[PDB]
Design a protein around this ligand. Structure first.
Ligand SMILES: CC(C)CCC[C@@H](C)[C@H]1CC[C@H]2[C@@H]3CC=C4C[C@@H](OC(=O)CCC(=O)O)CC[C@]4(C)[C@H]3CC[C@]12C
Ligand SMILES: CC(C)CCC[C@@H](C)[C@H]1CC[C@H]2[C@@H]3CC=C4C[C@@H](OC(=O)CCC(=O)O)CC[C@]4(C)[C@H]3CC[C@]12C
Ligand SMILES: CC(C)CCC[C@@H](C)[C@H]1CC[C@H]2[C@@H]3CC=C4C[C@@H](OC(=O)CCC(=O)O)CC[C@]4(C)[C@H]3CC[C@]12C
Ligand SMILES: CC(C)CCC[C@@H](C)[C@H]1CC[C@H]2[C@@H]3CC=C4C[C@@H](OC(=O)CCC(=O)O)CC[C@]4(C)[C@H]3CC[C@]12C
Ligand SMILES: FC(F)(F)c1ccccc1-c1cc(C(F)(F)F)c2[nH]c(C3=NOC4(CCCCC4)C3)nc2c1
Ligand SMILES: FC(F)(F)c1ccccc1-c1cc(C(F)(F)F)c2[nH]c(C3=NOC4(CCCCC4)C3)nc2c1
Lengths: 99, 99
């Protein structure tokens, strides 16, 4: 999910896209466990629950949240522009007196 | 089209890029139907109609719309900053009295 915000889309969520080469049935390996199967040896997850969930998650993370953060940063830089100059001037005394 | 905003570019829009392995001629399969062919067994779509359409769609979605949303969020956070404090203070009474 952390990578999902950087444009990476989960792969093991669609039966068609899912590939069994990556996964392993047992734990004696270094790749993720395979999806739970059925008596017919096919993926069992409904596939109409995961896709909308991922769509909503990606919409919330990639787009809305970053835009909100941009807005907050804009307001913050606008609000405290003048006080930052005074703070920098105050610290300039220490910076100059250091040498 | 929903995924198209997350940076994914459609593949079955260019004759060179289009691959027949994914598609299926008949419906007895779990992958999308193949593009309509011609008497010579080649893709039939003009290829000069789809590409500009996709370019315009991607330009509208990925870039313009999200930037507009960012602008709206910035204006909204700027406008209602003071009233939000009063609303939070009002709800603080209920939050404190809950316990
Ligand atoms: C505000 C909008 C733009 C955001 C959400 C729109 C779509 C991205 C979502 C909403 C409901 C979703 C659909 C809900 C159910 C299904 C059927 C699903 O196929 C199955 O259910 C078969 C299940 C099986 O084979 O076991 C494939 C995706 C689809 C069309 C989902 C794909 C994406 C849809 C259209
Ligand atoms: C069947 C599947 C594919 C779709 C449904 C699964 C989730 C997408 C549902 C389950 C619980 C739902 C959530 C229940 C509570 C909330 C909080 C709500 O926002 C708030 O917390 C503020 C409410 C307010 O302003 O008063 C927005 C929707 C959300 C995430 C709901 C949206 C959709 C959720 C996550
Ligand atoms: C404001 C600008 C920056 C946005 C649009 C610019 C280009 C991305 C678009 C505008 C018109 C498009 C062109 C319209 C027609 C064609 C020819 C097309 O090839 C064919 O028509 C052959 C058809 C066939 O083989 O059957 C390949 C793409 C190209 C150059 C299109 C590719 C992209 C172009 C240059
Ligand atoms: C031959 C192919 C490859 C290019 C042409 C196909 C589409 C790109 C054309 C067909 C109809 C056109 C649309 C007709 C109407 C509108 C609405 C217009 O914006 C408005 O609705 C507001 C108008 C106003 O401000 O008065 C912007 C262009 C658009 C999307 C036009 C732009 C280009 C469209 C989508
Ligand atoms: F910037 C932002 F915050 F996105 C946002 C900006 C502008 C307007 C609304 C929101 C918002 C707020 C909340 C809430 F206030 F409720 F937290 C949201 N919650 C969710 C989801 N909940 O669960 C999901 C993740 C876990 C899987 C199920 C889906 C996404 N999307 C929200 C969007
Ligand atoms: F933020 C935004 F809105 F993008 C936008 C922001 C700033 C200036 C203009 C726009 C805008 C407005 C409209 C309209 F107001 F007309 F709706 C647009 N329409 C379209 C397209 N129409 O159809 C397409 C999708 C379907 C396939 C054909 C191409 C894209 N791009 C627009 C850009």
């Amino acid at each position: 999910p952390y990578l999902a915000m950087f444009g990476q889309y989960p792969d093991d969520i669609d039966g068609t896209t899912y590939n069994f080469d990556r996964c392993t049935f047992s734990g004696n390996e270094s790749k993720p466990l395979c999806v739970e199967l059925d008596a017919n040896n096919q993926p069992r997850f409904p596939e109409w629950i995961t896709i909308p969930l991922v769509c909503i998650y990606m919409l919330s993370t990639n787009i809305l949240l970053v835009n909100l953060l941009v807005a907050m940063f804009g307001y913050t830089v606008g609000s405290v522009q003048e006080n930052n100059d005074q703070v920098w001037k105050f610290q300039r005394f220490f910076l100059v007196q250091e040498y």
